[PDB]
Amino acid sequence: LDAFSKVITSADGKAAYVGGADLQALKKFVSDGNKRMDAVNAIVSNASCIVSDAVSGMVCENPSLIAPNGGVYSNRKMAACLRDAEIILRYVSYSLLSGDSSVLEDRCLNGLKETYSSLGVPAAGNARAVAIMKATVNSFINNTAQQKKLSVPSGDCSALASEAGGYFDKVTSAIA
């Protein structure tokens, strides 16, 4: 995974392109190699739907969050939250691509609770948004969402779905 490590550590916008023998090895060393590509696509191709719906669900279940001075009152804070949702969502998606959560915990989760606490980002709302994304990502990986579908060979992706929920669990634990 040396190609991924390079572009993630450099974080300069240089892309890593994995095809052919490289891609064959990448799918070879993780489990359910091809299905895993379909599960990752299920997430990233819906990144705006998942994020929009979760943050919307967090507010509609607790509108105090968008009352004056609330956690997402005003467009700047609402934008900051939607961005956090996409940030967290994409670190989850790189974990499902790579088969481990190390980049998620090291580069995304390490010290995120203390940051949120000093900023006053309410931990309950955060966990609820993460929770909705987890449920939403679960439906898309299983291709059981109500409206947007994905066409792939029929089969069972419960293991990748569980592994995805596991990465979301790490977010939840870190956000307490």
Binding site: F4, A11, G20, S52, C60
Partner: protein, 63 residues
Amino acid sequence: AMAKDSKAPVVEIFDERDGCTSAGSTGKASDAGEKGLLVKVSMQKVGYNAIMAKSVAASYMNA
């Protein structure tokens, strides 16, 4: 520690096995033994979305 630069790994999956191609479809990597298939990963800054932010504010009560 976590970074503070709002950058996240952007994974893009490419399945062009149906034949439709564009300029980016070639030269990015070898395709030996995996025609039409590729995983792209880069670190991009996740920006603010004023339109989506305003949309959520006005629309969150509609599932």
